[PDB]
Amino acid sequence: VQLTLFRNLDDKFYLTPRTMYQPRVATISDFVQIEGCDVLFVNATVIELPG
Amino acid sequence: VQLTLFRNLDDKFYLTPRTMYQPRVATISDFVQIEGCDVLFVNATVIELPG
Numbered sequence: 001v002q003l004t005l006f007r008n009l010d011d012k013f014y015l016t017p018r019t020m021y022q023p024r025v026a027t028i029s030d031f032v033q034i035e036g037c038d039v040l041f042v043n044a045t046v047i048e049l050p051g
Numbered sequence: 052v053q054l055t056l057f058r059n060l061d062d063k064f065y066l067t068p069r070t071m072y073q074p075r076v077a078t079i080s081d082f083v084q085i086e087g088c089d090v091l092f093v094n095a096t097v098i099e100l101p102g
């Protein structure tokens with residue numbers, strides 16, 4: 001919960017801390033899969049998902 | 052070590068915090084592999100291991 005998720009120009013997902021701006025490439029081990037969604041989530045397909 | 056491991060009704064492994072009951076599915080990235088076993092470990096086969 002200490003990381004922020006954003007998107008670069010090429011629409012790749014990146015993570016950064018909030019203490020300093022040190023962006024890194026988001027991988028599949030950085031996420032937890034849950035049943036429901038949210039209205040504030042970003043919509044993406046399996047093609048654009050993190051590797 | 053802040054998470055508790057348990058089994059759901061379909062014999063699938065789940066992890067939850069001990070501050071609130073917020074269960075989530077356990078993945079292989081959540082585990083550390085060691086040589087030995089204790090007597091209080093659940094017996095399982097490679098087939099029924101977390102995805």
Ligand SMILES: *[C@@H]1O[C@H](CO)[C@@H](O[C@@H]2O[C@H](CO)[C@@H](O)[C@H](O)[C@H]2NC(C)=O)[C@H](O)[C@H]1NC(C)=O
Nearest residue numbers: 058086087088089090091092093094095096097
């Ligand atoms: C997990 O399986 C192991 C392997 O069978 C069990 O260890 C055996 O325990 C019995 C008593 O229940 C002993 O008589 C055997 O000698 C043990 N075998 C070995 C190879 O150590 C273990 O008890 C099982 N654990 C659980 C929680 O069911």
Ligand SMILES: *[C@@H]1O[C@H](CO)[C@@H](O)[C@H](O)[C@H]1NC(C)=O
Nearest residue numbers: 037038039040041042043044
């Ligand atoms: C995602 O799609 C849903 C419908 O499935 C829509 O209501 C929502 O506004 C979309 N969200 C974004 C961020 O585009």
